[PDB]
Structure formats: structure tokens, C-alpha cells
Structure 1
């Protein structure tokens, strides 16, 4: 049911956007078709966990005429597409920044045979523009519209700042200077857990966890009813854990299962694996890592992977997850006390996250 009404709204959104282009933007059938294809390829094919979370949060809150349930759930569907379109935008641009090769089982957008890198940058930016155009059209008469967009934009800003932390994490920040080139860091002194937690809170947690929850509360007209301090705590914790999972899968999960090929080693990413290895590694192991990290060469990449599993990273990961599960379990209860329905949706979202194989 929820996937069926979501996909119906997708066609609703797609039709508005593409007809507007024909009718008001002097667009030709060839480019309209190109953009329809761009939209489908970049926005569909995933699990829709972000978008679906908005629907479930809204559905969980309708109580605390059947025309209202219809309206609230349709609003949740549009908001769900706002986040999925936003992540579509993120993934198109990120795939360029990360020099990735596949995504969701297909080439990355920028790697598509007739998509130029210059068009791909623009296509990715069209995706974000669509998030605002859909909000403005579908929520024109909603009083929550300003708050919604104010919050969406702040989250987007936050993610961009997080992306900056990600993309500059392998350069000595003391030597960060537009006028002067600098190679990848050689001492990895900034590959700390503290610096890792910052990247991840900003690049992943706000838009992946907080935003779907907040938008669900908004379309429900239920935002002031919850503990937003507790709610943000949960989002940050779940979001960090989600990204630790992503980093671990990048290295250890066969690409066929994930739909994408991992680039973190090659890109010299400040991943969870890297910070946790270096914090506990002997000097000899750190030497090996340094001589093999941030290179395309497959044997060097295999050597890093070898180092990770020799330093018992799976030991650290099981213990991390248990510590997270513990704190998550506790915070949901704090939430349950005053917001039983919302806590239930958060609990469902956790169920989607804990020990995911994705």
C-alpha cells in the first residue's frame, strides 16, 4: 500500500514538473525525454527508506474526517519525494566528487555514455531545484510551507558543510590554502574518531535521519508535541551508526549485493575503518597502511583490507553496534513517555537500520 501510493505521487510530481518545462520554459520534446530519463535513473531504484519514513511517521501520528487522512498522507508522499529527490541530487554530485563507477546497479549518472560530466553537474542541480518546485506547487496553500522549507534548506546546508568535511579530510587542514597545492596527508594525524564523528553527523545524520522524522511531524501538524532534544539525539546516533555501516560495507560487502563499487580506500577517505585502525594500530601496521592508502592499485587496496581484518576491526564494530543499540533503546523510551506514536515510528526506523545488510 505505502509504496503504491508513493509511486502514484511520483507520477503526479513527474507530470507537473515536466509539463511546466514544456509549457513555461520553452522546452522541446527531446530534452523533456532526456530529463524524464534523468529523473527516473537518479530518483528511482533505491529502497526509498528516507521517503517511506516520512509516510510512516505521518501515518503513526494521525490521531494525536477521512479527508484529513488522505490529505496528510498525500503531503507525506510529496515530502518523501522532496527527500528522495534531494538525495538523488546528493548522489549525482557525490559520485562525481568520489570518482565512483556504479550506483544502484547501473553506471553513476556522470558515467552514463551520453551524459557529459558538465551536464551531470547541471542535472544534479536540477534535481534539487525540483525539490523546491514540488514543495511550492503541492503545498501552496499549506500554512506549514515556510517552516518546512526553512528546515529543509538548513538541513541541506548542513549536509553541504558535512560534504566539505568529507572532501577535505585527507588534507592537512593547517596547510589548507587555495593559492598553494598540497598532496594527500602523509601523517594521517587528523584521521581521529572526533574528526570522523563530525564528518558523519553533518554529511549523513541530519538529512538521512532528522529530516524524514521532522517532515513527518510537520505534515501531521504534530511537531510541537515531541521532545526535539531527545529526537535529535536519536537522529544523530542512528545517523552516525548508519554511516559507520556504509563505510564498513564499502570495504567488505561484495558490490553485487550493494549495487555500487567501493572507493573509500582509493579516495583516502576518513572512514570509520581508517580512524579505528589507526587509533589501535602498531607503528609497523601504520607504516604499511601509509604506504598503501589512497591508491587505485588493486593489490595496495587488498593490503589495506588485509590490515583492517588483521587488527580485528569486526571486533570493534560488534562492540560499537551494541553500544549504539543500547543508547538508542534508552532514548526511544524517553520519547515513548510523551509521544507513544512517534516513538513507534522511530522504533520502526531503527529496525530498518540495525544489522542492515542493505
Structure 2
């Protein structure tokens, strides 16, 4: 029912956007079918955890505060696809960075602009008569701005914006917070509370604190899998060492490494050579970072498993969905 309804609204959203282009933007059929294929390619195929989270929050709040149920459930599906389209927009922007008049790059940039604008068009249409339309766009635009700021922190974590000084645990948390946590964990929860009209009925401080901790828990495991999980099992090629990313493994190693090991780390980090990357993996393994990885995640999980209770003392139905979201993480 949740996944099935989420896909039916996708067809409804896609049909409106494409017909709007045909009826109001003078678009020819060839380009409409071209944009249908691009939308399906970029927006479909993932796990839809961000979009389904908006649905799961909405169904938990209508059970504990007829005609309003079906409306809120439909509004949550549109908000779910706003985040999915936003995620597709971020992924397209990432492809342009590593892929390199070249018409394929021109279309890639155009795709990224259309996916972002489509979040506005589908919101301005299906929420035209909603009282929360203005507040929804402001929180959506602010979180999107937050993500772009977090991408600046992540991209420039190894240089001086006109370098391992910013390779600290507090700065790692800043990167995870702005680049990932706000739009992946906090935004689906907020949009689920907005369509359920129960936004001022929750402790936002505890909610934000959980979103950052869940994103932190997810990112620490992600950095670890990027380094040791093989490509055919991870689904991609791990490249954090070659890209000199400010990963959890790097900032944790630098805190417990000897003075001579840091020299060996700095001399091998950020290189595409197969053995310098293997040297970094060897340093991570010998420093017993795997033992700290289990302890760090357990402590974060303890903070998560205990922070949901503060949220249920004032909003019980909200906490049920955060546990399901944490169960996915």
C-alpha cells in the first residue's frame, strides 16, 4: 500500500508536469518523451527512503492527532516526490563533476535545472489551495540551501578556499549535518509534520538532534564501507582515499596515529596509486579503527535509542515513525 500508492502519485505528478509542458510551454512530443525518459531514469530506481518517510510520518499522525485522511496521504506523497526529485537533482549535479559544444554536458546541466524546478512546479500545483504552501516552500528552499553549503564544506575540506587542519571530528559532523542530515533525515520528517498539520506540536530541538545523529550514524558506516567493502558488494567503487575525503576513518586515524604514521598517512592520502591507497587501508587496519567503529556507532545508537523517548513524551505518534526511519539506518 505505501510503495504502491507512492508510485501511483508519481504517474499523476509526471503526467501533470509533462502535459503542462505540452499545453502551457509549447513543447513538442519528441522533447516530452525525452523528458519522460529522463525523469524515469533520474527519479526512479532508488530505495525511496526519503519519500516513503514522509508517508510513514503522515499515517502515524492521522491515527492519533475520512475526507482529510486521503488528502493528507496524497499531500505526503507529493512531498515525498519533491525530496526524491531534489535527490535526483543532486545526483545529476554530482555526475557533471566526475564525468569531466558538448551537447551531453549541456543536457546534464539542463536536467539538473529541470529536476529542481519540478519540485517547485509540483508543489505550486497540488498545494495551490493549501495554507502551508508558503511555509513548505521556505523550509524546502532553506534545506536545499543548507545542502549546497554542506557540499561546499565537503568539497573544500582539503584546501584553503581562496590541508588536514579541518580534518577534525567536529568539522566532520558539520559536513554530515549540512551536506546529508538536513535533507535526508530532517526534511522528510518536517514535511510529514507539515502535511499532517502537526508541525508546532513537536519538540524541534530533539527532532533536529535525532536527524543529525541518524545522519552521523549512517555516514560513519558509509565511510567504512567505502573503504573496505568490495565494489561488487558495495555497488560502486570506493574512492574516498583517492579523493582525500574528510571521512570518519581519516579524522579518527589522525587522532590516535603516531607522529611518524601521520607522515606516512599524509604522504599516501589523496592519491590514485593502487599501493598508496592500500597503504592507507593498512594504516586504518593496524590502528584498530574497526574496534572504534563498533564502539562509536554503539554510542551513537544509544544516543538515538534514548532521544526518541523525549520526543514521544510530547508527540507519541511522531516517535513511531522515527524508530522506523532509524530502523532503516
Q: Which moved more, 1:215-224 or 1:232-241?
A: 232-241
Instruction: Count residues with an aligned counterpart.
Output: 329
The CA distance in 2 between the partners of 1:256 and 1:39, in whole Å, is 27
The CA distance in 1 between the partners of 2:160 and 2:200, in whole Å, is 43
| TM-superposed deviation, 1:249 | 1.9
Cα gap change, 1:289 to 1:76, in 2 (>3 Å): same
| TM-superposed deviation, 1:115 | 7.1
Q: Deviations over 1:26-55 (max 9, x none)?
A: 222222222212111111111111000000
Q: Deviations over 1:282-321 (max 9, x none)?
A: 2232222222221222232222222212211111111111
Kept in 1, the 8 Å contact 2:217–2:301? The answer is no
| TM-superposed deviation, 1:65 | 14
Q: Name the SS of the counterpart of 1:172 in structure 2.
A: coil
RMSD: 2.1
| TM-superposed deviation, 1:265 | 1.5
Cα gap change, 1:314 to 1:65, in 2 (>3 Å): closer
The answer for the alignment partner of 1:298 in structure 2 is 274
Q: Which moved more, 1:161-170 or 1:254-263?
A: 254-263
Kept in 2, the 8 Å contact 1:266–1:301? The answer is yes
The CA distance in 2 between the partners of 1:305 and 1:120, in whole Å, is 35
Structure 2 alignment gaps of length 5 or more? none
Kept in 2, the 8 Å contact 1:266–1:294? The answer is yes
Q: Name the SS of the counterpart of 2:157 in structure 1.
A: coil
Cα gap change, 1:346 to 1:310, in 2 (>3 Å): same
Cα gap change, 1:227 to 1:143, in 2 (>3 Å): same
Q: Name the SS of the counterpart of 2:245 in structure 1.
A: coil
The CA distance in 1 between the partners of 2:271 and 2:186, in whole Å, is 35
Q: Which moved more, 1:24-33 or 1:126-135?
A: 24-33
Cα gap change, 1:87 to 1:115, in 2 (>3 Å): farther
| TM-superposed deviation, 1:260 | 2.3
| TM-superposed deviation, 1:81 | 0.3
The CA distance in 2 between the partners of 1:137 and 1:55, in whole Å, is 19
| TM-superposed deviation, 1:173 | 4.8
TM-score normalised by structure 1 residue count: 0.87
Q: Which moved more, 1:53-62 or 1:299-308?
A: 299-308
| TM-superposed deviation, 1:270 | 0.9
Which aligned runs of 4 or more in structure 1 are off by greater than 6 angstroms? none
Kept in 1, the 8 Å contact 2:54–2:192? The answer is yes
Q: Deviations over 1:87-117 (max 9, x none)?
A: 11111112333569xxxxxxxxxxxx99722
The CA distance in 2 between the partners of 1:220 and 1:62, in whole Å, is 7
| TM-superposed deviation, 1:336 | 1.2
| TM-superposed deviation, 1:195 | 1.4
Instruction: Say whether 1:321 aligns with 2:297.
Output: yes
Cα gap change, 1:257 to 1:45, in 2 (>3 Å): farther
TM-score normalised by structure 2 residue count: 0.95
Kept in 2, the 8 Å contact 1:98–1:263? The answer is no
Cα gap change, 1:115 to 1:276, in 2 (>3 Å): farther
Q: Deviations over 1:176-197 (max 9, x none)?
A: xxxxxxxxxxx52221112111
The CA distance in 2 between the partners of 1:193 and 1:23, in whole Å, is 52
The CA distance in 1 between the partners of 2:102 and 2:323, in whole Å, is 43
Cα gap change, 1:120 to 1:168, in 2 (>3 Å): same
